[PDB]
Amino acid sequence: SSGQISIQPTFSVQRNLPFDRPTIMAA
């Protein structure tokens, strides 16, 4: 992996916020 897994939001807009459900809760 070594990559991102979630997105830090920088603006105020209608946006589904991405996170990789697996790898995260996989611990």
CA distance 16 to 9: 10
DSSP secondary structure string for all residues of the chain: --S--B----S-S-----B-HHHHH--
Vertex 3: Cα angle to 25 and 11 (nearest 5): 85
